[PDB]
């Protein structure tokens, strides 16, 4: 259809676009994962201190 | 060689010979070898073939033996082409199914 040169141009550009979308995903996931870990740790601390649960072993 | 090593070597070769002879001539082992040899001969010297010596007058040769090659070629070519067509049909079906399911 198109010369091989244009096909490889398209391949490179598509690789870059996929990498950009992965960059968006990585940024959002890292931020929310840090927030999640903080929230879960705080929840476990509050639970143990409040006497709601006992965490042993 | 040294006669002590000579004794050892003679004993070892005698043991090897006896072991081989026993394993080959033992009843069940002998039967297994005897049947497998003939099976191998059949496979090697009587495998399916398309070319063979024709020693019969045209009046004494079956039609199967004049069109076997063509039948074989028809079967193989038809199988290949039909598999190709089935691959194309499956490609189209999968594309349509996953397209209609989303995007």
């Amino acid at each position: 259809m198109f010369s091989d040169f244009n096909m490889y141009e398209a391949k490179v550009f598509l690789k870059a676009v996929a990498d950009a979308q992965n960059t968006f995903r990585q940024t959002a996931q890292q931020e929310n994962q840090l927030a999640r870990y903080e929230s879960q740790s705080q929840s476990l601390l509050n639970g143990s201190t409040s006497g709601a649960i006992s965490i042993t072993g | 060689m040294n006669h002590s090593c000579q004794k050892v070597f003679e004993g070892f070769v005698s043991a090897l010979y006896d072991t081989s002879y026993f394993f080959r001539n033992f009843g069940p082992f002998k039967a297994t070898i005897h049947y497998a040899t003939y099976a191998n001969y059949l496979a090697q010297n009587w495998a399916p073939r398309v070319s063979y010596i024709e020693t019969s007058t045209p009046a004494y040769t079956l039609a199967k033996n004049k069109y076997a090659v063509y039948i074989v070629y028809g079967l193989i070519g038809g199988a290949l082409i039909h598999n190709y067509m089935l691959d194309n049909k499956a490609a189209q079906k999968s594309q349509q199914y996953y397209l209609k399911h989303r995007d």
């Binding site: 040169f5 141009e9 490179v12 | 398309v50 070319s51 063979y52 010596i53 024709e54 033996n65 004049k66 090659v69």
Partner: protein, 43 residues
């Protein structure tokens, strides 16, 4: 004396030899990693 489908046998043997040699040597499917230093670049 006559051999049924002798020409078919000759061509089948030739094809078998050709295919076996092709796959064993991979004559047609060379490697070009050795030429990369001696090649121009685009983009």
């Amino acid at each position: 004396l006559p051999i049924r489908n002798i020409q078919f046998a000759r061509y089948h043997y030739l094809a078998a030899v050709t295919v076996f040699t092709y796959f064993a040597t991979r004559c047609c499917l060379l490697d070009y990693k050795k030429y990369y230093p001696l090649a121009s670049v685009k983009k």
